[PDB]
């Protein structure tokens, strides 16, 4: 009679999508700063 026996995957997917969006935003900020330095 012995018995041996928020989602992280949701959290992981949200973290991955947020990281991608943040990387895109940082690249956009860098490009905009470079253009503004020339304009």
């Amino acid at each position: 009679r012995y018995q041996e026996c928020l989602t992280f995957e949701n959290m992981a997917g949200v973290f991955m999508l947020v990281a991608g969006g943040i990387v895109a935003g940082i690249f956009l900020i860098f490009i905009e700063i470079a253009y503004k330095r020339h304009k």
């Binding site: 928020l6 949200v14 943040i22």
Partner: protein, 132 residues
């Protein structure tokens, strides 16, 4: 039992674990990195923004700098409201389920040795010259 017995599970929220904690840490790190990037006092304002648009913007933490700051704030707010919606849905789903497992789970577990010693004298209404 006298009336309805259920498990409130007040502390059983998915918090206090390592599931959403890692996501929260990653999101906070990303937000701080983006704030530093857009920076091109500040620490206190950044902490205020991190604590604010995570729970709720119902506090004076307004301090934008540039368009990229607005874009990152929009993305972080979208993530935060998605998290709030997910938590509301999860708690409602828990409300859908229920827990009424057991109360004693044993014919001699603790009380059935000396009910007076346990304090409540549970009734022993057997039958004369019966079977049990």
């Amino acid at each position: 039992r006298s009336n309805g017995t259920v498990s409130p599970s007040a502390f059983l929220e998915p918090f206090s674990a390592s599931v959403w904690v890692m996501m929260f840490v990653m999101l906070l790190i990303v937000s701080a990195i983006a704030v530093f990037v857009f920076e091109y006092f500040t620490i206190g304002k950044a902490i205020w923004l991190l604590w604010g648009l995570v729970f709720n913007n119902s506090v004076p933490v307004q301090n934008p700098k540039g368009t990229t700051s607005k874009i990152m704030v929009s993305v972080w707010a979208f993530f935060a409201v998605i998290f709030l919606a997910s938590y509301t849905a999860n708690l409602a789903a828990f409300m859908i389920q229920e827990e009424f497992v057991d109360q004693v789970t044993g014919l001699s577990d603790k009380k059935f040795q000396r009910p007076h010693d346990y304090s409540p004298p549970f009734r022993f209404g057997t039958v004369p010259n019966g079977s049990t």
